[PDB]
Design a binder for this molecule. Structure first.
Ligand code: ZN
Ligand code: ZN
Lengths: 359, 359
DNA sequence: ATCTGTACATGTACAGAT
DNA sequence: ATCTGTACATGTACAGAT
DNA sequence: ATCTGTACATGTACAGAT
DNA sequence: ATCTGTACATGTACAGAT
């Protein structure tokens, strides 16, 4: 039933190759510029993240998420109003001049300055790329990235996310986060939290206090690992194991939301990370791989639908790494929007998903 | 039944504490001496291996296995005629004078010499410790280890194993080894084979050719990982998962073999490694954790037992990492020994294992 | 002379195409 | 199925630095 | 660069429940 | 017997400091 939809969201090798050539050229160039010659971002490191590198990119290879992560050693971290996700970054005992001293704002490290210099260097280097049609997208509020528009005949979007890497232990609001013990295990969880944690610019433009100095936690790496190692059995989806319908369900969900969101302006507040969080919670609820047999697809998909409905109705969706962070708060999303989405999803659900047959 | 046997085979944390304290003391001192007083074994590192660190040690914490591994770069391996497991170690371009100069017989690295020096150093440092009752065991032919006898009242043995470390790709005799694809998976296997391989002195005194220049592959690190990561499910034997009886069956099997070897001299060619290999192949045949339920212990045990008999019947126990290397070959164990053991095994098997019930 | 950094080699999982 | 491109891990060459 | 503070796995020991 | 919860113990990773 949903097989043909998946066969339609399935990417094509020609498109993947054609896009990745160009994307890799550009990104490598920027990485060089930022790293090689004298930047404040020297030593910055690449980390490919997002749907394309998690193998859950649908329809087209037209979105690439790339992290330029920079390690900031002695870093004092201060939570922003018990939010869980938002922090302020101070420098402990800076011994010398410090390559980020121009980005200091009062006493704290400024995300806005840093991101502006970052953006300036990217623009300058992009100007010199003569073999590819590439421009820089206008700054979007909320965005932690410098977005590039590539015309490789087709339109490809590339988010260059500026990140701060901390190698220390994760914030204490992540303690009860990442509930994968009865699913991926305790050794996997223990080894994952030994990885560094990341910080992106919040880049909110509401004018509120601090604002330009406020950072947000990122775990795109942990999520990438989880997407690549998703079974309770190590051989899941491997060449000597059984395929599950997890990633496919994720795809179907993301697609439904994409179609809906491009048909209705009332869904502007919603994004694919909401459904990603939701499917994490569904995987924690149903750890067993047999609960995700391609046998059904229909049933597990419908179950995900159901859970996300409930998330909407209760106006709750805890961050999978920060459980005191509701992504479906009234603060973030109005209940009118959520009920609207609820209605749309319900219609599509008990009407045989006609929107999948659209565009 | 077998549960009571497992109860008496279980170690006591008091004995564990008392033994480990002293063992760690001595080991640390020897390691320090090794890395410090400017030896050719400077830069040697420690790797704990064996039943104790696999939590498969039975009865008493009276045996400890420690590898002193030395990273030896730029080695050329020359197989000892189609054995798969045995090699001569030459050097590509013999780098500096290199600390291993005097251990070289032209191009080939002498094992007997390097081990003789290793041993001499260890003896000199064992002489110089007066707060522990520790001596050095007489050299066993065939043994790659300088063995220490600690008479911290209860006799403890410590094998200090001289290992060469190599970070290249594993020898091609291992290409078809480690058949864990359907059990632990392809990523686990690939990762484990990204790890270094080790070479220990064969140290036979048979008098034959290449006697003191022959090295042997060791995979004790890989085995350790496998033992502590034994399930098809990642939650196997974790706090939020279900237990299995894998390690238990290994323990019982090891115990049966120990008792039989304790009684009969006709079994001197047999070691716990035959058992370990056998159960590796068993776990590979039965990948499911539910094929190893603690409620089916007996039937699991007997199962392994039967397999062992077949390995005895067909005179074939393929090494788990080097398939072309037969452990039960005529060259290694006389047919008569391999019939004696089968007879004793069947006997104990049909009569309720009376040998378990005695000391 | 040797040492270091860059980036070319090499091997395989994932998933597309047939 | 087999074949196959990409992404990512590690190993290793060698120019150029000391 | 050698040494050291935090974190949690794996395991034993024993009592209270079932 | 069987199970389970808490106490208790060793081993191992590793960032970061000196
Ligand atoms: Zn799967
Ligand atoms: Zn287990």
């Amino acid at each position: 039933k949903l097989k043909k939809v998946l066969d339609k969201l399935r990417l094509k090798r020609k498109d993947i190759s054609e896009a990745a050539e160009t994307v890799n050229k550009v990104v490598e160039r920027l990485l060089r510029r930022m790293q090689k010659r004298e930047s404040e971002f020297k030593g910055v490191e690449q980390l490919n993240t997002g749907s394309y590198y998690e193998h859950v990119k649908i329809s087209a290879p037209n979105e690439f998420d790339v992290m330029f992560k920079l390690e900031v050693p002695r870093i004092e971290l201060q939570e922003y109003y018990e939010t869980g996700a938002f922090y302020l970054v101070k420098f402990k005992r800076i011994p010398r001049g410090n390559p980020l001293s121009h980005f200091l704002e009062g006493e704290v490290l400024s995300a806005t300055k840093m991101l502006s210099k970052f953006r300036k260097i990217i623009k300058e280097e992009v100007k010199e790329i003569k073999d590819i049609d590439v421009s820089v997208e206008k700054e979007k509020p909320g965005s932690p990235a410098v977005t590039l528009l590539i015309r490789n005949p087709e339109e490809i979007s590339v988010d260059i996310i500026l990140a701060l890497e901390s190698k220390g232990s994760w914030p204490i609001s992540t303690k009860e986060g990442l509930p994968i013990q009865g699913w991926l295990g305790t050794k996997v969880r223990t080894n994952l939290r030994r990885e560094p944690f990341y910080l992106v610019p919040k880049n909110a433009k509401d004018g509120n206090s601090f604002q330009g100095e406020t950072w947000r936690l990122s775990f795109s790496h942990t999520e990438k690992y989880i997407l690549n190692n998703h079974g309770i059995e190590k051989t899941c989806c491997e060449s000597s194991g059984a395929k599950c319908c997890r990633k496919e369900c994720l795809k179907l969900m993301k697609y439904l939301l994409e179609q809906l969101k491009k048909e209705f302006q009332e869904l502007d507040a919603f994004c694919s990370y909401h459904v990603k969080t939701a499917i994490f919670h569904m995987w924690t609820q149903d750890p067993q791989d047999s609960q995700w047999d391609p046998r059904n697809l229909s049933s597990c998909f419908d179950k995900l639908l159901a859970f996300f409905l409930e998330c909407l109705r209760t106006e709750k969706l805890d961050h999978y790494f920060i459980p005191k962070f509701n992504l479906f708060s009234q603060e973030l999303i109005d209940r009118k929007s959520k009920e609207f989405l609820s209605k749309k999803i319900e219609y599509e659900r008990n009407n045989g998903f006609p929107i999948f047959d659209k565009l």
